[PDB]
Design a binder for this molecule. Structure first.
Ligand code: MET
Length: 527
């Protein structure tokens, strides 16, 4: 056992935070929350990528110091994530002095291993992606002016020709070991088609990789190469190292880093159990990073999960915004999170209209979950305001019980893939089954007609709501608490695999107090 270590990418601070960053960090957050619910030690990590030409030039364009610009924008990222109400354990910044030391330490290992030489890069480079590209991965496009230029096929951003004496990492020498790693861990990249992409790309051959740049090109906004002040460390080698840095930082109660340990084993976090990333940055994580780790003799991550990129009303996000805080203030924080995790799987296919948002809010959160919670806690149905003791189970009772008992196992596998969408769907399939059982039994009639039968129906329903809610708690962290409070579930029973079990809450447990205008999810007007 070790600390379950989950990460998000660290984001460029060239501009203000937006939905892409909020989405990636949310996924990271949800994975961490699920493992805490299982009672595991978790360290969840996010942060900002603050060096490089991209960032330094964005600061120049605003006519501000790189130190002042990065600090200000990093501040906006922290404020946004705070407001999004994640449970991230640490926010790292690559300008941190302790991160810097770790980067120099990793570089030195790579050099001492013989995997870094002085050579030349002569080729295309995308500043906006901080990415080296071959002629096969560029094409014709236009400037900011509208003059003809070359652009990345990858991303569409302008590319430039670089010809510089650079320190080069021997990535070509790691091809075989990388292929061995992919084939021996066929779950290590998710989803499967991105795993195939990576293997196909590495099968073709790998060139060596420039890991430094001449200091002027960078506007001196980068980590100097140890032993050679004319060169700065490639922003991506610096950036990827944040995962190692974060694995080695002791953090105090307020979230401040207070100490860098010498050895990752001391904190038991490294290597990451899951790196959450966008598809745009797959090669850095699935090819370069494991190669750096193999060179350094460090263990490799267990999973890399790469999600897709987004649209609002089937259009690129100018004249089309999606501010997550404003949407969350509009429809709800947990509701917005549910929507983002339910609507998209590993694709760009998601309908992010306010229409579809309202349809899921009303249909799934309000009509399926909320209505159910209200039914089984209603004083008109649950006359004694408690968990009743069930009488004998019918076959129908048992079919539903069986679904509830099976759910934790199924949801668990989905959370570990990870495929959060599938986990949510599984839980809601069980919520729908519970609703249909309740409709079929009509407990409102049973109050008058067979109060004994009602004890059974009502107990099964409460327990189905409790289990589904426990498994939804990583997705609806605030609302799950409210639900548990309404059900009167003691704190101890709100986490731990012990409580995945059917029957964990005893009969006789009292419900929470009923507030005057109780409303868990408010249906919105279709507009
Ligand atoms: C080590 S993850 C670095 C990600 C990069 N800063 C980006 O925003 O795409």
């Amino acid at each position: 056992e070790k600390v379950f270590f989950v990460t998000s990418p660290i984001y460029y601070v060239n501009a203000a935070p937006h939905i892409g960053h909020v989405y990636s960090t949310l996924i990271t957050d949800v994975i961490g929350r699920y493992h805490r619910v299982k009672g595991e030690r978790v360290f969840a990590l996010t942060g900002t990528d603050e060096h490089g030409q991209k960032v330094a030039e964005a600061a120049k364009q605003k006519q501000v110091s790189p130190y002042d610009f990065t600090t200000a924008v990093a501040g906006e990222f922290k404020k946004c994530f705070e407001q999004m109400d994640y449970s991230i354990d640490y926010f790292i910044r690559t300008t941190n002095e302790q991160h810097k030391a770790v980067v120099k330490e990793l570089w030195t290992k790579l050099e001492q291993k013989g995997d870094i030489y002085l050579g030349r890069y002569e080729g295309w480079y995308s500043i906006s992606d901080e990415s080296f590209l071959t002629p096969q991965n560029i094409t014709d496009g236009v400037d900011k002016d509208g003059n003809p230029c070359k652009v990345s096929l990858e991303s569409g951003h302008v590319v430039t020709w670089v010809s510089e004496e650079n320190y080069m990492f021997r990535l070509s020498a790691f091809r075989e070991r990388l292929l061995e790693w992919y084939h021996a861990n066929p779950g290590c990249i998710v989803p499967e088609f991105r795993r195939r992409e990576v293997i196909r790309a590495v099968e073709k051959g790998l060139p060596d990789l420039s890991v430094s740049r001449a200091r002027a090109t960078l506007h001196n906004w980068a980590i100097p190469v140890p032993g050679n002040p004319d060169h700065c460390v490639y922003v991506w080698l610096d950036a990827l190292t944040n995962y190692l840095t974060g694995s080695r930082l002791r953090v105090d109660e307020s979230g401040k880093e207070v100490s860098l340990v010498d050895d990752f084993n001391e904190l038991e976090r490294f290597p990451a159990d899951v790196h959450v990333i966008g598809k745009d940055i797959l090669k850095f994580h699935a090819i370069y990073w494991p190669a750096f780790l193999l060179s350094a003799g460090l263990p490799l991550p267990k999973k890399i999960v790469a999600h897709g990129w987004w649209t609002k009303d089937r259009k690129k996000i100018l004249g089309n915004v999606f501010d997550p805080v404003e949407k969350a203030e509009e429809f709800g924080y947990d509701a917005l999170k549910y929507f983002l995790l339910r609507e998209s799987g590993f694709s760009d296919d998601g309908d992010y209209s306010d229409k579809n948002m309202i349809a899921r809010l009303n249909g799934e959160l309000a009509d399926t979950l909320g209505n159910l919670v209200m039914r089984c806690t209603s004083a008109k149905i649950n006359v004694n305001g408690e968990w009743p003791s069930p009488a004998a189970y019918t076959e129908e009772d048992e079919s539903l019980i069986q679904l509830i008992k099976d759910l934790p196992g199924t949801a668990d596998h989905y959370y570990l893939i990870p495929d959060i969408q599938k986990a949510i769907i599984a839980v809601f399939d069980v919520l729908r089954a519970i609703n249909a059982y309740v409709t079929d039994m009509a407990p409102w009639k049973l109050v008058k007609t067979d109060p004994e039968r009602l004890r059974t129906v009502l107990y099964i329903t409460l327990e189905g709501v409790r289990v589904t809610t426990l498994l939804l708690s990583p997705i609806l962290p605030r609302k799950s608490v409210v639900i548990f409070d309404m059900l009167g579930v003691p704190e101890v029973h709100r986490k731990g695999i012990e409580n995945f079990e059917f029957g964990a809450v005893p009969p006789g447990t009292r419900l929470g107090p009923a507030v005057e205008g109780e409303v868990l999810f408010s249906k919105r007007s279709t507009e």
